[PDB]
């Protein structure tokens, strides 16, 4: 055992310069020879796993941090929630990228760190709540009910919406067949001044219609209008008699499921949101940590062309750029 200040000094350099496997090797083998890892040691490991988006590794660090009885601070929860948003997901051609992310409940660890942040007394940031909503919403996951309740209390705390969160949450509500929640998201992002959405503003075609949960509550318990409260009319339309309209509602019920049961022959069982949606964080393409990029998609290969950075038969310093 050398100097523990020297042990922390190499841990500072590897989180700052090299990849995520170096801090996981150094802190684990250093804990086994007897280096007492403090909160300063775990925040440097959790900085490197949050940058590369290693969702399985953040769970293993927080299991060792709770075993060593070292209390996390507000900077520690800043890396747990922002690190779950940077996890790899998406679909190559018929190949699921990071399929073991689904069995881990990494959206729930990002939610559990939010509950432990306010219970221990720390102040959560605006990028924690935008990164926690992303983990419920990303194309391997379909959780828009919990992401709606998270966004509802995000406005009550006067948080501002991140433009990456609006891009993911709009595609999740479109995929899960919710146009009222998607039109209200575009209407909200245009009014709050979110960048990239000040031109997209949709009219509220559901202005007179009640909520979808209120109709199911009214249907369990005016009686002619109670059964047809869910039916949407143009104003120049009238309902049928109650025996004739109820036979017509079962016609549309069996016709909608008949169309949705037919597979599209060249989709590999995927929605159009899932097609060509491979995600790695911004570290994979010649970039490093920035705070405003929560879940930043890696830049395309047309940003850096070869033979404009170095001439022919000469090496370029981009080893893993064009590899997706």
């Amino acid at each position: 055992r050398r100097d523990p200040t020297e042990f922390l000094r190499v841990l500072r350099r590897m989180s700052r310069t090299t990849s995520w496997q170096k801090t996981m090797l150094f802190a684990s083998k250093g804990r086994m020879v007897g280096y007492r890892l403090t909160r300063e040691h775990y925040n440097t490991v959790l900085f490197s796993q949050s940058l590369w988006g290693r969702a399985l590794e953040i769970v293993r660090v927080v299991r060792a941090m709770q075993e060593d009885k070292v209390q996390p601070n507000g900077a520690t929860y800043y890396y747990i929630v922002n690190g779950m948003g940077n996890a790899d997901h998406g679909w190559n051609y018929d190949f699921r990228i990071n399929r073991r992310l689904e069995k881990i409940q990494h959206w729930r660890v990002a939610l559990e760190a939010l509950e432990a942040c306010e219970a221990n007394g720390f102040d959560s940031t605006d990028t924690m709540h935008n990164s926690a909503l992303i983990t419920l919403v990303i194309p391997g996951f379909n959780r828009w009910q919990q992401a709606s309740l998270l966004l509802q209390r995000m406005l009550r705390e006067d948080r501002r919406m991140h433009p990456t969160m609006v891009k993911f949450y709009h595609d999740c509500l479109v995929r899960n067949n919710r146009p009222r929640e998607a039109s209200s998201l575009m209407r909200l992002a245009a009014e709050r001044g979110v960048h990239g959405y000040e031109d997209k503003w949709e009219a509220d075609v559901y202005k007179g219609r009640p909520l979808d949960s209120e109709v199911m509550n009214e249907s369990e318990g005016q009686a002619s209008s109670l059964a047809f409260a869910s039916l949407m009319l143009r104003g120049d339309q009238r309902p049928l008699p109650e025996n004739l309209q109820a036979l017509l509602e079962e016609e549309t019920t069996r016709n909608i499921e008949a169309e949705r049961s037919v597979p599209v022959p060249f989709s590999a069982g995927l929605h159009a949101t899932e097609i060509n949606s491979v995600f790695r964080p911004r570290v994979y393409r010649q970039l490093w940590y920035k705070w405003q990029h929560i879940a930043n998609r890696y830049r395309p290969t047309a940003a850096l062309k070869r033979r404009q950075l170095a001439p022919r038969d000469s090496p370029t310093g981009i080893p893993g750029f064009y590899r997706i």
């Binding site: 020297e6 190499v10 590897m14 170096k22 083998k29 250093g30 086994m32 020879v33």
Partner: peptide
């Protein structure tokens, strides 16, 4: 069977020195 923990400690210490080789000088 009893002297495997100290051998494990020596092996993990050797791995820690191999990781210390990343630091370079001093």
């Amino acid at each position: 069977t009893e002297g495997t923990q100290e051998k494990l400690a020596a092996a993990i210490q050797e791995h820690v020195q191999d990781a210390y080789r990343f630091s370079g000088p001093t």
